[PDB]
Amino acid sequence: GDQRFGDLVFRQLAPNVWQHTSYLDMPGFGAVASNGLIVRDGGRVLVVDTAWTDDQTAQILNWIKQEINLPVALAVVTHAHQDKMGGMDALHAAGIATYANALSNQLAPQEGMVAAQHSLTFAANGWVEPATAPNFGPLKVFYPGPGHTSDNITVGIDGTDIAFGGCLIKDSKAKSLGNLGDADTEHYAASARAFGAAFPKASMIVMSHSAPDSRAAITHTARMADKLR
Ligand SMILES: O=c1cc(CP(=O)(O)O)c2cc3c(cc2o1)OCO3
Ligand SMILES: [Zn+2]
Ligand SMILES: [Zn+2]
């Protein structure tokens, strides 16, 4: 059940979880879809990733207003590329508290991104330091190691079977690992496996550029990344 809302697509994944999808014409690659998440936690809404642009991200907020009609308490963005952070200004214009890996905020200006307002830091084992992610409700934030980028982070949704790999994970039939321009090729495979081990009960793996898949997306992405070293 895809719902077309202007130029964006929304798909319900669970009673309190929806996937948002936006598109950007990349010259040389066609119109590239990017996915994020919208989660209702009681009387508030939590967002994972912006759309590619401010205008598209404002449209996500419009869809939330019409379809959920609860305040958006926070957004967390999963690395400093345009598909995930390109709409930061729209979140700030709306008064929404924003969070990203400290490293994503450090990298944002040179990537042409606007930094989030708050920085997440991570324990040695990858789990977010909880003091830096206050009021995250069911969102469980995990840094799996460098992969698609050095700053990529991932998010599980407690109380569901869903985990979000962002651009780290590709679907079980993907031919390649996509844009490796900022990737850590040596560590990618281990980081993909660490994501899987952090969320062992997640049977629905959501990712940036493909429809949700089974855990075969993780095993396949890791096996593909094995070839990178
Ligand atoms: O420089 C880039 C950056 C991105 C965004 P990201 O996905 O790496 O976060 C990008 C995305 C694409 C692509 C090429 C790309 O080139 O082709 C299919 O999707
Ligand atoms: Zn990226
Ligand atoms: Zn991507």
Swiss-Prot record:
Which biological process annotations from GO are given for this protein?
antibiotic catabolic process; response to antibiotic
Provide the species name: Klebsiella pneumoniae
> Where do the annotations place Zn(2+) 2 binding?
D83, C167, H209
Q: Which cofactor does it need?
A: Zn(2+)
Q: How is the cofactor bound?
A: Binds 2 Zn(2+) ions per subunit.
Of the intact sequence, the residues represented are 42 to 270 of 270
Question: Taxonomic lineage of this organism?
Answer: Bacteria, Pseudomonadati, Pseudomonadota, Gammaproteobacteria, Enterobacterales
Binding of Zn(2+) 1 occurs at H79, H81, H148
What is the name of this protein? Metallo-beta-lactamase type 2
Q: How is its activity regulated?
A: Inhibits by captopril, thiorphan, dimercaprol and tiopronin. This enzyme is not susceptible to inactivation by the beta-lactamase-blocking agents clavulanic acid.
What are the record keywords, sorted? Answer: Antibiotic resistance, Hydrolase, Metal-binding, Periplasm, Plasmid, Signal, Zinc
Entry binding sites for substrate? K170, N179
Q: How does it assemble?
A: Monomer.
The reaction(s) annotated as catalysed by this protein in its Swiss-Prot or TrEMBL entry are: a beta-lactam + H2O = a substituted beta-amino acid
Q: What else is known?
A: Enterobacteriaceae carrying this gene (identified by PCR) have been isolated in Sweden, India, Pakistan, Bangladesh, England, Scotland, Northern Ireland, Australia and the USA. The organisms they were identified in were K.pneumoniae, Enterobacter cloacae, E.coli, Proteus spp, Citrobacter freundii, Morganella morganii, Providencia spp and Klebsille oxytoca. In India most isolates were from community-acquired infections rather than hospital-acquired infections, indicating the gene is widespread in the environment.
Function, as annotated, reads: Confers resistance to the different beta-lactams antibiotics (penicillin, cephalosporin and carbapenem) via the hydrolysis of the beta-lactam ring. Does not confer resistance to the polymixin colistin or the fluoroquinolone ciprofloxacin.
GO CC, sorted alphabetically, is: periplasmic space
